[PDB]
Amino acid sequence: GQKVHPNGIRLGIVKPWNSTWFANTKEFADNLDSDFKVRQYLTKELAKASVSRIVIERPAKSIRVTIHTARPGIVIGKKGEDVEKLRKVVADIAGVPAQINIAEVRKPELDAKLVADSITSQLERRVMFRRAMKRAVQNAMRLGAKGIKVEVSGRLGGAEIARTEWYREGRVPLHTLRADIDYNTSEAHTTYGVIGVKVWIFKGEI
Amino acid sequence: RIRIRLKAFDHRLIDQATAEIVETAKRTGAQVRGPIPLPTRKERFTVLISPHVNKDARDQYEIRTHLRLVDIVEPTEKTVDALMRLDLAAGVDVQISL
Amino acid sequence: DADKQEYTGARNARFSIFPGSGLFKKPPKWVMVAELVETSRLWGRIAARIDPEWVEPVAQHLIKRTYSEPHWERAQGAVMATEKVTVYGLPIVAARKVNYSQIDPALCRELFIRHALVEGDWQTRHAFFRENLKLRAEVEELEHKSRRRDILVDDETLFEFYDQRISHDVISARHFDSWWKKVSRETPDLLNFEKSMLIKEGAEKISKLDYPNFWHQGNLKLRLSYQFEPGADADGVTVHIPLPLLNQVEESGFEWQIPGLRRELVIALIKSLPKPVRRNFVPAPNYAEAFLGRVKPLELPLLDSLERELRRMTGVTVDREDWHWDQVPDHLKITFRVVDDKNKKLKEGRSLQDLKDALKGKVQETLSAVADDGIEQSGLHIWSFGQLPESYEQKRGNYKVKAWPALVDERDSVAIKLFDNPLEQKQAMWNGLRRLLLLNIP
RNA sequence: AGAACCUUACCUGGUCUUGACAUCCACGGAAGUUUUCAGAGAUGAGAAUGUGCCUUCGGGAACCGUGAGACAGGUGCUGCAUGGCUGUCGUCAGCUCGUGUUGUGAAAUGUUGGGUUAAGUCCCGCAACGAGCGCAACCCUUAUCCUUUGUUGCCAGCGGUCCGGCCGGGAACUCAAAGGAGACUGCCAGUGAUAAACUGGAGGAAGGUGGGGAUGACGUCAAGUCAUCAUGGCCCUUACGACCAGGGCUACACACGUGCUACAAUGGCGCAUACAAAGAGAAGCGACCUCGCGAGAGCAAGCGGACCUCAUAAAGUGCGUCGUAGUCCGGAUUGGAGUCUGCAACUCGACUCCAUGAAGUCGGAAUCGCUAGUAAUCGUGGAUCAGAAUGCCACGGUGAAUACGU
């Protein structure tokens, strides 16, 4: 392992921060722990809601959480009912009054993290990984990605010895910082161990 | 007289934030000192990357606290009612000292 | 319950309609029962549909009233809120817009007095209301002139003017009109504001000569309007120009401003000089007072006035390109507006060339609307027009309006059309006369 | 990125069994506060008071206490079952694919050939035509100027000077941080396939990826981590789980690794004096003043900090002395007296003072780093941290030698 994280190096250039708020050294730590403590619940409770990305703002003793999902009708629910149920619980965790803004994710197979979470599912649904990575790679090309590289590793399909597989189509300029690369990871907990998933998606040069 | 201290982690975020304050203050009472650029405290941090060994390889991140100053020197208390309605972005800290 | 055959009864208890009922197949939205019985689950035996409007007037001792979203509305001049009623916690009415001000008298009295009177955002025929809006209007133009917001006293002092002289009966807008009917028989002038809006500031010495309401240019007179809101699209000393008078307007001497910004103008002009040039005139405001202490407006143009006197005091020459007008704030730039007889704005800008470059067609149609005579002809071969007018001058109410008629060639004949500047009149005279000659020549 | 207890997983001993940590059920009390006895320690016993919410008059929420079973727990094994992350060849310039062609085929051609470059970098040729992962650039810092603004930052031109930017003041300058400009073989001469390119010059603060950094391809080592975490399987579940006290991780006939301090006169000691950058500070940085030889102590400003504090930089220079003496070099070791932190400084801290002054007089075979603001040398700050660095990371000062050459 020698490649650097592409989202981390692209933070000051083209990829926005996953959380933007200010704190001095007194409350910086408890800001981070509470920023974590909101994050498992939103991924656990809304695992069926196909959540892609979560952003936190802290505007002067409040919290604004931006949930990016491809199926907003699940998290909002029937007749606008479940967001308010989600409203007090994050305030219960954070201790401050907060407001959550639902951000819809149109064009869903062009987001790496939702691609990573969707490609997580069928491996623990025990279908073949060869067809799975193939399905996740042509539709990005079909619906207009400019480059996609995916990766799996570790006990594929019941293999007793770990093997790594990667499919790449298009262009993935990982060494170009101004290029816009979409990348996030996910894991699948099969009966044999841990399937690893890495997926890079490139869309634009600036 | 009235000192507005503005601190943020981003220079591309604080410039409009200090523009919103200095334009609204000059709009309804005028006479505002220029938005002062002030030296940035850079917290450079050394972290080991590997879980177990190889000390010699490390990562290098840093925190850049972009700090700005805006001064109001004259009594212009018509602004001080509507200036609280600005509700600026979350990435910029503001401190007021009189 | 919505799309579910359990029935959220009183409190958190849930029961159902009995299977032996006639209406067991169609459970209604609001059903009541006679007997509650505990069994494998809870049920109601004798069920029947009621309208949810019936229950509330018979349960006056049982309703829990709730009020949320207290917001003041202009449409009734009072505080509005959505009401919620509950019997043992049962939402008889989920939401209903109600008048929150009519319910409680305490907090809305301070709200109504501040909004409808101090801000004065009312649509009423009250005698005090028309004068009080004007009284707040005659001090805001002073602050739009003096460019300082310290003269006008705060609105809380205006709030205490209304509150200490109103009776305690007024808690809403409806109580005020009843109060205003009795009270105005005695003291109409009590609610009208006094002239104590200026106290001490030292900026109240606003002189009418240094802030004139009119600008003179030859035989013309240009209306001056004022506004103090920096960074706006239309800030600065604004001139109101009649559209037929446009042809007599010239841009020279327009940039001298009123004397209230002349000290501030030339500071920015010296500031507009580059740093090697700027260092000569140190400090810039001190050089301005010596400059303004020796020059008068319109004796020289603005660019030439600064160059000669700065060389007079120093001896180092300044070129015409050393002065930058973009670095001058836009409020120092005079806003240019053209007006009709009803002050309807057609075009606006910050130079006279921001007007004349787009109004030429409409100025021509302004000329032709007044010109109801057959000077403009078409299909002409030989000079039959007599002594042709060198300049066509008309009158529209107070002001004159000038033009210059000339001939027009049409490749088959000669026409006559009006022109608004003597030079292209001569050009159109030249092409017309030559074409008229060779038609006149056999 | 910091073992006195804690950390701590080890050992001995004393203790617990739905458990130190979760969720569900049932019952009681709100919580909590204070006091005493015993025990090295977790128990047992009192006194004060709990009791705020929510009107649907009831219950619920937070918490504590007890019992049961589902269950928890493990720094236990397997890195040769794994994810994630890392070192490595190596910042080496290389590594592949679609179509076509050749060959029965494994495969080749592209990618070889002539130059050229730091570079499959670029030009030409070419059964290859193109493309992708890499190279470079785009990213950060530094080297110059201009625009904006000017505090707590600066003082050129003014004035008063309390001689101190101190003040009034001035925004010029340093600087601060935002915006731009600039360096691209751009221009010229020669060479070269009329090419790529190379060599020299002009101009310029910088000239041939200007300097440094970040960035590391396909993969190798069944490389290292089950002890950061997650994790499949196996193992204990009255114990390989859990609590506490004390000891151990700091031992010592030895050997190796990496550093620090010296063997001295380019030096030591004393006196006097000049020149920095960078960073940290609220359970904190901690001025001044007083006490003590000193570690520090008391007192107590300002400071969430371009203001206040850490905080006098030192090698450097000028004086006097030492004079080649195991020495006025070197400080180890040892004894006594103390200071601070912390329940506690015995094992097992750091520092001060007094007394002592081991070895060492330039180091065998062999071996290491460094191509310029580098090596060498002199100091400073920071992470961890209650207390603790000669280590690590970062910042400045002085400042080289040499590269014929393969």
> What resolution in Å is listed for this PDB structure?
3.1
Beta-sheet strands, E only, within chain B: 2-8, 36-48, 58-72, 92-97
- Dihedral pair phi/psi, residue A40, rounded to 5°: -75, -35
Cβ count near A73 (within 10 Å): 11
- C-alpha C15/C-alpha C48 separation (Å) is 14
Is the distance from CB of C338 to CB of C355 less than 8 angstroms? Answer: yes
Find out whether the peptide bond into A6 is cis, omega within 30 degrees of 0: no
- Rounded to a whole number of angstroms, the distance from the CA of C282 to the nearest CA of chain B is 20
Q: For residue C417, what are its two tokens?
A: 């059309």
Alpha helix locations (H) across A17-128?
Answer: 28-37, 39-45, 72-75, 82-85, 87-94, 112-124
Domain boundary assignment for chain A: 16-106, 107-206
Say which experimental method was used. Answer: cryo-EM
Q: What is the DSSP string of C349-370?
A: ESSSHHHHTT-HHHHHHHHHHH
- Scanning every strand, the nucleotide with its C1' closest to B66's CA turns out to be D177
Q: Are strands A98-104 and A63-69 parallel, antiparallel or unpaired?
A: parallel
Task: Give the three-class secondary structure for C411.
Answer: coil
Q: Between B26, B75, B78, which is nearest C230 by CB?
A: B26
**C229 inside 8 A of chain B by CB:** yes
Round and report the angstrom distance from CA (B54) to C1' (D223).
12
Cβ count near A53 (within 10 Å): 18
The single-letter DSSP state of residue A125 is T
The architecture in CATH of the region B1-98 reads 2-Layer Sandwich (3.30)
**C271 inside 8 A of chain B by CB:** no
How are the residues of chain C apportioned to helix, strand and coil, as percentages rounded to the nearest 5?
A: 35, 20, 45
Whole-Å CA distances, C286 to B93, C173, C234, C289, C292: 39, 57, 30, 6, 10
- Scanning every strand, the nucleotide with its C1' closest to B34's CA turns out to be D149
Round and report the angstrom distance from CA (C392) to C1' (D333).
121
Q: Nearest to residue C11, comparing CAs of C71, C90, C95? A: C90
Please give the radius of gyration of chain C, using alpha carbons only, rounded to the nearest integer: 38
- Which positions in strand D are less than 7 Å from the protein's CB atoms? 1, 55-56, 81-90, 131-140, 146-152, 157, 169-173, 176-179, 213-219, 222-225, 228-233, 278-283, 304-306, 382, 392-394
**C149 and B29: CB-CB below 8 Å?**
yes
Q: Which residue is nearest to nucleotide D227 (CA to C1')?
A: B52
Shortest CA distance from B30: residue in chain C: C148
Whole-Å CA distances, B61 to A9, A178, C226, C440: 10, 19, 54, 91
The single-letter DSSP state of residue A6 is H
